[PDB]
Design a protein around this ligand. Structure first.
Ligand SMILES: *[C@@H]1O[C@H](CO)[C@@H](O[C@@H]2O[C@H](CO)[C@@H](O[C@@H]3O[C@H](CO[C@H]4O[C@H](CO[C@H]5O[C@H](CO)[C@@H](O)[C@H](O)[C@@H]5O[C@H]5O[C@H](CO)[C@@H](O)[C@H](O)[C@@H]5O)[C@@H](O)[C@H](O[C@H]5O[C@H](CO)[C@@H](O)[C@H](O)[C@@H]5O[C@H]5O[C@H](CO)[C@@H](O)[C@H](O)[C@@H]5O)[C@@H]4O)[C@@H](O)[C@H](O[C@H]4O[C@H](CO)[C@@H](O)[C@H](O)[C@@H]4O[C@H]4O[C@H](CO)[C@@H](O)[C@H](O)[C@@H]4O[C@H]4O[C@H](CO)[C@@H](O)[C@H](O)[C@@H]4O)[C@@H]3O)[C@H](O)[C@H]2NC(C)=O)[C@H](O)[C@H]1NC(C)=O
Ligand SMILES: *[C@@H]1O[C@H](CO)[C@@H](O[C@@H]2O[C@H](CO)[C@@H](O[C@@H]3O[C@H](CO[C@H]4O[C@H](CO[C@H]5O[C@H](CO)[C@@H](O)[C@H](O)[C@@H]5O[C@H]5O[C@H](CO)[C@@H](O)[C@H](O)[C@@H]5O)[C@@H](O)[C@H](O[C@H]5O[C@H](CO)[C@@H](O)[C@H](O)[C@@H]5O[C@H]5O[C@H](CO)[C@@H](O)[C@H](O)[C@@H]5O)[C@@H]4O)[C@@H](O)[C@H](O[C@H]4O[C@H](CO)[C@@H](O)[C@H](O)[C@@H]4O[C@H]4O[C@H](CO)[C@@H](O)[C@H](O)[C@@H]4O[C@H]4O[C@H](CO)[C@@H](O)[C@H](O)[C@@H]4O)[C@@H]3O)[C@H](O)[C@H]2NC(C)=O)[C@H](O)[C@H]1NC(C)=O
Ligand code: HEC
Ligand code: HEC
Ligand SMILES: CCCCCCCCCCCC(=O)OC[C@H](COP(=O)(O)OCC[N+](C)(C)C)OC(=O)CCCCCCCCCCC
Ligand SMILES: CCCCCCCCCCCC(=O)OC[C@H](COP(=O)([O-])O)OC(=O)CCCCCCCCCCC
Ligand SMILES: *[C@@H]1O[C@H](CO)[C@@H](O)[C@H](O)[C@H]1NC(C)=O
Ligand SMILES: *[C@@H]1O[C@H](CO)[C@@H](O)[C@H](O)[C@H]1NC(C)=O
Ligand SMILES: *[C@@H]1O[C@H](CO)[C@@H](O)[C@H](O)[C@H]1NC(C)=O
Ligand SMILES: *[C@@H]1O[C@H](CO)[C@@H](O)[C@H](O)[C@H]1NC(C)=O
Ligand SMILES: *[C@@H]1O[C@H](CO)[C@@H](O)[C@H](O)[C@H]1NC(C)=O
Ligand SMILES: *[C@@H]1O[C@H](CO)[C@@H](O)[C@H](O)[C@H]1NC(C)=O
Ligand SMILES: *[C@@H]1O[C@H](CO)[C@@H](O)[C@H](O)[C@H]1NC(C)=O
Lengths: 273, 834, 273, 41
């Protein structure tokens, strides 16, 4: 290269735009789709559509079951408020606070309405996890030592163990069992694709029903939390924060009903003709 | 908006620029003298070395109750001091693992051992400590403070933001109220307040337990009156701002009234109560010292809080607004009022006003070693007894905190040395002289062993004494000068110069007149003293004569009525085989209507011996690994203090049967077996005996599940007689330690838990699957055997659910189950095309 | 059981007598020996000794190669001195200080001559590891926060990164490569036992030589440290601490020469007869 | 022997009973005014 200054590479270091564990899934399934599109011209002209649909929907269902698990948009909330920012400063900022409660943690986003307000850049996105292998209390203590802005710590301690609003145990158990149901549904999807390749129509059409029923069971498990965060106040200055059902909830509902419909259609079409 | 300052945090963080953690909640208590433990780390001094606590409380701190104070201090001052100390320090929450430092009642104590027996142990549990301090000698154990060490009104608003949120109504800038706007709301009942039972009646509900900022603010009606005063005062300040600034929101009104209330509280607690407690005016404010360490010392818990008990009276008056005492005798007995729920005399607002006025015009007890019986005999007991000894449990807490001796603390603080016993208190030695002799006899004339609390009480004549005054004054000076948000620190922007003067000229009578709408001529200017001209004198000094007697002692039994149902449940679980056997019987009935021979055996079955040996050594290795971990390597979680043999026997067999039940499918992988039958493996493994091996792994994995179920039948019994403060340490997230100590019943563990309820179904499935798959019934009806033997699907489903809900450890069965299940289902799919 | 006191089990909690990762090895190989002794009466009378020796020595060599790796007695030292004990105390103790330098860490032992001297129990045995997955500096900082006795911290900081006596890099690299050579020797022992079961005399007799040569190579790698800790002073009061070659060194030497001798005997006996 | 006091450590640890790390080597520099950086950090 060329070394004539110090440092040698004088430039701003970049940051990844989106979530990594979602871009991985999108790229993997786009790669598989491209491979099958490449193979496509090597199949008979009649069954081209019958293969295209059968592979596209199978891949889409398998990708949704896996992306919804690691998603953090099951219950989401959002509000625009004026809050305090940091310690040793009487200055207030105008931000867009948000909550994103997943199955094994919560992501809190503080973002200024102008991103540059106090000669700073307010674009936070913080994650506190309560999975079975993690400890929420140690993560909150570490995020309190390193001094995050004030509203981030407020919303982060609302979910802490042994708080006057008992959200920790409920969200932890519900997320644990919803994640387990989703893993079982993924296993059933794998077995459905296997027992559909070799000619077994009944068993494939019966594993699709299981792939759907376990997604609906995950919905049932996670919906036992909405009756708990409703009374607990999430006031941030002059604004209240209300959480409702996010996109991952309705996505799981839609693909569950789709799998159930496909299973029933296969069973019926196997019985009569 | 209108908030032109930096609002103060609730948990005390970021108060200091350099040390962010100073004063925060859950922070260490920083001691003045190095810790004096038995081994140098974490182990208290005990009864062979130091005298017996209950035997020491009877020889020095015992006497009558009609002793007036020397300075004419009033009861309102005593309980205002209790309120202030609830703001500063709280060290009474037991910590994990559960450790006990019990109090052995001497044989014949007329109170705790009337029917003379031998062992009448009173339980006592050590408090919470810091997890970075208990291991090595150059860093002994340090306990942690449950509230914020700043004098920041952390007893009115709470020590966290989420706590303060449950106290506000979010309308008008006020704290939440109930049906009566003069009392808080007792709605939140799960994780807010201390739900200790009433010792005199046993009531333990959350109805009548008001919500304050201090977790234990309902301990007495007299400590409740101060909390009600400071609740009504906030709701009164936030209601005058809304009259001057009608355009302010709710957060502005709250943060403007909170600031004024904290400043008024600081002014009173520092410049009106302290000059009365110590009889010494503190030095004037020099300015904010960013480098002074304001931490709370463990000796301050004894100098301030445990000393105030020498002044608590036996009864408390109630007064009109104009000198009428018959409850607005009419005094409240203090022993019958601990954790009172709905007192029939304190249900209106005028009644609490009458209590505050009567406390204001009643002189407290003399400051000396004597303590009234309502504290050393009838203190509300936290474990198993409902009554305890406050002094014997204050001596046991000094030993638990590792506090120095009396002559050793009197030296680190720069006080003159003391040689004889008649020098602790010359006036006491001249008048009585029979208390110092008894103390000497108890300590074997070893003055260097006299501990902090008995020494500071014998040294006190009319005031706290030379040693206690020093600790208290130094602590308060360091709390004032080290706090950034002190209302006199003009560089924090809270108040202007005129507001600071208007606050510095406010007293407690001004607050009692604001809240209680009485004429200011009904109280005295300084309500911490009652002098010869003040209004509404006492009727007479209140001794323990005419008052009702204290409610007697009763022992709590957790396993009281659970004897019959426990036997029925165990008998039913043991009768599961005897009902499946009857079902199989009727099913069948209706379906009908020399050494050379030894070595020869060895050389015949060399391969069988090798395979069985490998299998059983693997199961033994798993059992021994778990038994090792729970016998030699798990002491940081005190689970072997409750169940030792049970948990080892039940967590070894768990790891062994997780393997026996997983690898029992490799004996039925038929296609894989028939493929490996002709291979070089045939020289080592006899594949002809693959079903006989099925019945061996199966009939030896039930002898371990019986041990598992029996081990957990023993555990569930020991879990249903242990206190709630122990279970809260064992199983967090399943139990929470509030005041009411009572565990869950036995049937809660069996029929209302994931492991307990899946375990019974597993026992039933096995009891059917094993009795029907028996050589006596398999030979007589193959259809019954074939139908019942398909329960293994249900079995593995239940086994995956059973281990979830990680109670003792995280699940591991799926790790054991992945590989054999995959091999089995693959062999099953292969045997489907053919 | 019986619950009538608090706690229910009132007794001293035990401690394991010896090292765990050594007791595991001893029990495993004793179990294998017992199994083969059980099988022994099922073999012809002539080849009983030929099987007994061939299995006992093979097992012993395989166990030594594995126990020497996890041992911490490659270079050892020991001295009896009077030292200070703790902070905020002018009192001295009479102890038996010792060093035990292994391949991936060091064990330091402080033990009083009477174990009970200052109303305490002085029987320490502390381990600081410099393996590739560990950090010596963080372990030393954590052992300095938690306040261990004074001589333990002295000897523990002698090996710390960036000390005036450069022991860290040398001991780290030498231990790393000696451990690698020992793993290769273990693999060669496995292959020797495999290629000896099926009849291959030449290749078995030639893998035994490798099993020996890699042990001797481990000795060569670790012996490049003795010329470095010699000048650095280990004074503890009035006593000096000298380290020499421990038992693991000579054990590896002995088994290496044994494997080499067996390999040469097999090769010679394969050539002539 | 003749050393009748507690010899002073070389790295400054354990000089204070309560704050063991005060004055030690490699410890923070504690400022008098909040830090004035370009972005605050
Ligand atoms: C949910 O959530 C989650 C969570 O978040 C997620 O996840 C995620 O995601 C993402 C993607 O997208 C990511 O993350 C990210 O990342 C990034 C990157 O990283 C990297 O880098 C970094 C940086 O560094 C730098 O800097 C610093 C300071 O800061 C320093 O110190 C250093 O040294 C460096 O420096 C350098 O560079 C620079 C440039 O840049 C220059 O200038 C200089 O000179 C130098 O050269 C780093 O740090 C990192 O590292 C880390 O990590 C690792 C791993 O982990 C480790 O290993 C290491 O060690 C480290 O760590 C540490 O720390 C931690 C904490 O952090 C701890 O824990 C540990 O222990 C240690 O201590 C790497 O490397 C980044 O960047 C980011 O961050 C951001 O964000 C966050 C949140 O949001 C926060 O917290 C932070 O703080 C930040 O923020 C900030 O910034 C921004 C910009 O960027 C802004 O905007 C904001 O606002 C803020 O600001 C503030 O501050 C600043 C300063 O700081 C200022 O300026 C302003 O004014 C204001 O004040 C993040 O982190 C990943 O991938 C993931 N993961 C994780 C774990 O993260 C998810 O996705 C969600 N989900 C959904 C669905 O959504
Ligand atoms: C080399 O080296 C290495 C190293 O060492 C080795 O290895 C090893 O080995 C061995 C075998 O043999 C072992 O070790 C051992 O172990 C044992 C056991 O452990 C267990 O336990 C424990 C205990 O605990 C208890 O205690 C405490 C106090 O201390 C408390 O805190 C707790 O809580 C408990 O308590 C309880 O109990 C008691 C009774 O005991 C009662 O009383 C009470 O009440 C209650 O109840 C524990 O701790 C543990 O745990 C731990 O660990 C785990 C695992 O790791 C974890 O998880 C947890 O968490 C924990 O941890 C913690 O800590 C740590 C540190 O330690 C950190 O790291 C973390 O982070 C956390 O924080 C278990 O469970 C033990 O015991 C031992 O120890 C000992 O030793 C050592 C050394 O030596 C030291 O360091 C220590 O300190 C100790 O010492 C002491 O003691 C002794 C007796 O025992 C004595 O003798 C001495 O001297 C000393 O003394 C001192 O101190 C004391 C107090 O402390 C006093 O008293 C006196 O006086 C003085 O001062 C050990 O550790 C194992 O196995 C292994 N490993 C390891 C890692 O370790 C090897 O082997 C070598 N090599 C060769 C070749 O040789
Ligand atoms: C953990 C589950 C499990 C237990 C416990 C168990 N078995 Fe079985 N058993 C199986 C499975 C799985 C099969 C295979 C059934 C199949 O796929 O045909 C099987 C098959 C059998 C067969 C069928 C052999 C054949 O002709 O194919 C017999 C006989 C048998 N088991 C006897 C027993 C006996 C006797 C016991 C204990 C008293 C027992 N089993 C306990 C799981 C179990
Ligand atoms: C068929 C075997 C079986 C029977 C019967 C059984 N268990 Fe278990 N149990 C297990 C296994 C296996 C585990 C460990 C699961 C794991 O580690 O993933 C376990 C674990 C447990 C655990 C700990 C779960 C955890 O969170 O770690 C409890 C509690 C338990 N069993 C209670 C019972 C009770 C109560 C009964 C009936 C009285 C019972 N079990 C009967 C097999 C059984
Ligand atoms: C590949 C061919 C064979 C390989 C075998 C050797 C591999 C290394 C072994 C590591 C094991 C280990 O380290 O165990 C660690 C654990 C406990 O850990 P700890 O002491 O807390 O951790 C610190 C580790 N220290 C001490 C080294 C620092 O001890 C145990 O479980 C002991 C339980 C007994 C196991 C029973 C097996 C007996 C045979 C069955 C008889 C019927
Ligand atoms: C630590 C404990 C020490 C144990 C020492 C003594 C062990 C005693 C074992 C007794 C062996 C024996 O007597 O044989 C009885 C049965 C008979 O089999 P068969 O040939 O009569 O059908 O044979 C069996 O029981 C079979 C067991 C081994 C069969 C292995 C088959 C592998 C199956 C397929 C796996 C994929
Ligand atoms: C923040 O302050 C601005 C300034 O007046 C105001 O217009 C805006 O409404 C405030 N935000 C909220 C959420 O009230
Ligand atoms: C901060 O920003 C304001 C407005 O953009 C500007 O006037 C000021 O100089 C900035 N301060 C620093 C330190 O850059
Ligand atoms: C004092 O009590 C009497 C009767 O108990 C009552 O009539 C009178 O109103 C009371 N005084 C005041 C000021 O309330
Ligand atoms: C307090 O304020 C009042 C009101 O004017 C004043 O009369 C008095 O002198 C001040 N100081 C006191 C009461 O010590
Ligand atoms: C203290 O109160 C009594 C009556 O309770 C009174 O006689 C005495 O004068 C008071 N003390 C002083 C110093 O006035
Ligand atoms: C330790 O002190 C004793 C007391 O005189 C002495 O005899 C002994 O030699 C000393 N130890 C050493 C290693 O010098
Ligand atoms: C320490 O031990 C000495 C001698 O054994 C003994 O005299 C002293 O009382 C002990 N101290 C404690 C606190 O046990």
């Amino acid at each position: 290269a060329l070394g004539h200054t110090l440092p040698f590479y004088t430039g701003t270091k970049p940051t990844f735009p989106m979530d990594t564990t979602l871009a991985v899934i999108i790229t993997i399934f786009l790669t598989a789709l491209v491979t099958f599109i490449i193979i496509l011209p090597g199949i008979r002209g009649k069954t081209r559509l019958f293969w295209l649909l059968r592979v596209v929907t199978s891949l889409f269902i398998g990708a949704v079951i896996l992306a919804v698990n690691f998603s953090s948009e099951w219950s989401v909330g959002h509000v625009n408020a004026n809050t305090t920012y940091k310690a040793f400063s009487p200055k207030w900022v105008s931000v867009d606070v948000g909550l994103q409660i997943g199955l094994g943690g919560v992501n809190i986003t503080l973002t200024g309405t102008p991103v540059q307000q106090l000669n700073e850049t307010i674009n936070y996105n913080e994650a506190f996890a309560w999975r079975l292998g993690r400890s929420y209390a140690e993560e909150y203590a570490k995020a309190l030592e390193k001094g995050l802005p004030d509203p981030v710590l407020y919303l982060a301690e609302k979910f802490t163990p042994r708080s006057p609003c008992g959200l920790y145990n409920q969200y932890r158990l519900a997320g644990h069992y919803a994640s387990a149901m989703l893993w079982v549904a993924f296993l059933c999807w794998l077995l459905a694709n296997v027992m559909l390749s070799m000619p077994v129509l009944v068993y494939g059409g019966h594993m699709l029903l299981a792939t759907g029923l376990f997604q609906l069971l995950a919905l049932f498990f996670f919906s036992m939390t909405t009756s708990l965060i409703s009374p607990c106040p999430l006031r941030l200055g002059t604004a209240v924060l209300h959480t409702h059902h996010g996109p991952a909830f309705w996505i799981t509902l839609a693909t569950g009903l789709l799998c159930i419909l496909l299973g029933l259609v296969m069973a019926v079409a196997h019985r009569m003709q | 908006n209108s908030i032109s300052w930096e609002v103060q945090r609730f948990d005390g963080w970021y108060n200091n620029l350099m040390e962010h953690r100073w004063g925060s909640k859950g922070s260490r208590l920083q001691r003045l003298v190095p810790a004096s433990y038995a081994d140098g780390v974490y182990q208290p001094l005990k009864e062979p070395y130091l005298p017996n606590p209950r035997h020491l409380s009877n020889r020095v701190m015992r006497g009558s109750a009609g002793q007036p104070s020397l300075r004419n201090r009033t009861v309102l001052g005593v309980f205002f001091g209790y309120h202030v100390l609830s703001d500063l320090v709280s060290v009474e929450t037991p910590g994990c693992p559960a450790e006990f430092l019990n109090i052995y009642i001497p044989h014949g104590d007329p109170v705790f051992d009337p029917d003379k027996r031998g062992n009448v142990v009173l339980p006592f549990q050590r408090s919470r400590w810091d997890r970075n301090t208990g291991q090595s000698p150059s860093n002994p154990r340090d306990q942690s403070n449950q509230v914020t060490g700043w004098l920041d009104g952390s007893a009115i608003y709470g020590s966290s933001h989420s706590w303060s949120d449950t106290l506000r109504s979010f309308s008008g800038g006020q704290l939440a109220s109930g049906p009566d706007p003069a009392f808080p709301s007792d709605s939140q009942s799960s994780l807010l307040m201390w739900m200790a039972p009433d010792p005199s009646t046993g009531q333990g509900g959350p109805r009548g337990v008001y919500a304050f900022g201090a977790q234990r603010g309902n301990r007495e009606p007299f400590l409740q009156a101060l909390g009600l005063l400071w609740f009504r005062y906030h709701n009164l300040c936030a209601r005058k701002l809304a009259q001057e600034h009608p355009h302010w929101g709710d957060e502005e009104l709250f943060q403007h009234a909170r600031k004024r209330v904290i400043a008024t509280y600081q002014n009173i607690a520092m410049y009106e109560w302290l000059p009365s407690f110590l009889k010494q005016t503190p030095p004037e404010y020099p300015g904010y010292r960013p480098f002074l360490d304001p931490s709370i010392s463990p000796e301050f818990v004894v100098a301030s809080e445990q000393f105030l008990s020498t002044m608590v009276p036996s009864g408390v008056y109630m007064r009109n607004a104009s000198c009428h005492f018959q409850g607005i005798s009419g005094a409240l007995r203090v022993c019958n009022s601990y954790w009172s729920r709905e007192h029939p005399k304190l249900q209106r607002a005028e009644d609490v006003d009458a209590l505050l006025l009567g406390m204001a015009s009643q002189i407290a007890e003399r400051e000396d070693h004597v303590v009234v019986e309502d504290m050393q005999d009838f203190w509300p007991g936290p474990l198993k007894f409902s009554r305890t000894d406050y002094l014997a449990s204050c001596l046991q807490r000094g030993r638990d905190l590792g506090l120095p001796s009396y002559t050793k603390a009197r030296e680190a603080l720069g006080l003159s040395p003391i040689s004889h016993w008649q020098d602790i208190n010359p006036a006491l030695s001249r008048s009585n002289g029979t208390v110092l002799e008894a103390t000497a006899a108890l300590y074997n004339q070893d003055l260097s062993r006299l501990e902090l609390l008995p020494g500071g009480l014998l040294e006190s004549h009319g005031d706290p004494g030379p040693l206690f005054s020093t600790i208290v004054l130094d602590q308060f000076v360091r709390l004032r000068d080290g706090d950034r948000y002190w209302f006199e620190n003009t560089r924090n922007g809270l108040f202007s110069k005129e507001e600071i003067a208007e606050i510095r000229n406010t007293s407690l009578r001004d607050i009692l007149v604001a809240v209680t709408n009485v004429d200011p001529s009904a109280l005295q200017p300084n309500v911490f003293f009652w002098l010869a001209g003040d209004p509404c004198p006492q009727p007479s000094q209140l001794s323990a004569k005419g008052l009702p007697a204290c409610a007697p002692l009763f022992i709590r039994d957790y396993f009281e009525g659970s004897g019959f149902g426990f036997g029925l449940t165990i008998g039913t679980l043991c009768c599961f085989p005897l009902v499946s056997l009857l079902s199989a019987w009727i099913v069948a009935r209706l379906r009908k209507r020399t050494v050379q021979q030894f070595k020869r055996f060895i050389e015949n079955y060399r391969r069988h011996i090798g395979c069985v040996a490998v299998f059983y050594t693997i199961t033994g290795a798993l059992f021994l690994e778990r038994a090792y971990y729970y016998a030699f390597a798990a002491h940081h979680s005190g689970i072997t203090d409750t169940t030792r043999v049970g948990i080892i026997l039940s967590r070894g067999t768990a790891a062994s049967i997780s393997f026996m039940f997983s690898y029992i499918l490799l004996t039925m992988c038929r296609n894989l077996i028939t493929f490996l039958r002709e291979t070089f493996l045939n020289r080592y493994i006899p594949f002809d005996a693959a079903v006989d091996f099925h019945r061996l792994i199966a009939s030896t994995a039930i002898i371990l599940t019986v041990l598992h179920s029996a081990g957990h039948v023993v555990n569930v019994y020991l879990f249903s007689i242990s206190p709630l403060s122990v279970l809260s340490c064992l199983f967090p997230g399943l139990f929470h330690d509030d005041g009411s100590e009572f565990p869950q019943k036995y049937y809660w563990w069996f029929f209302q838990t994931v492991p307990g309820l899946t375990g019974v179904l597993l026992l039933l499935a096995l009891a059917i699957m094993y009795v029907f798959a028996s050589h006596h019934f398999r030979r007589r009806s193959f259809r019954g055997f074939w139908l019942t033997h398909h329960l293994y699907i249900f079995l593995y489903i239940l086994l995956i659910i059973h281990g979830s809900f990680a109670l003792i450890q995280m699940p591991r069965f799926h790790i054991f189950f992945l590989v054999p299940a995959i091999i089995y289902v693959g062999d099953k799919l292969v045997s489907l095309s053919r």
